[PDB]
Amino acid sequence: GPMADPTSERWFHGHLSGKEAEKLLTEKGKHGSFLVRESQSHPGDFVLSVRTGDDKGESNDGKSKVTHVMIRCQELKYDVGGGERFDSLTDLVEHYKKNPMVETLGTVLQLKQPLNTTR
């Protein structure tokens, strides 16, 4: 349903840009934190931003490292590019919450806990 937003969850943040979502995780979140938001470069799609690596230097240095993942949203269908595609974003995030998705640079997004919407 259009009134029943699938994004009415704690990990979905309304208006956030690429670095804003990053600032969210790098400053307010922690290792394994993820949040999905509406894409500004790709209007109509969503993005999963995650905090990869630890900030104490047991994975990388220079605080933690945030990667954002593109969630293709066509006809209210969500997919990062892996597994089954869901009509709800909750299933999407939880799917990769158990099955970490990997970048070609080695950065693999370990979705563990959602970044609470600070409002």
């Binding site: 470069s41 990667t67 954002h68 993942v69 593109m70 892996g82 990997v102 970048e103 070609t104």
Partner: peptide, 11 residues
Amino acid sequence: EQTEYATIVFP
């Protein structure tokens, strides 16, 4: 990586 929206290469 930095924004970029990740490659996500499932091997």
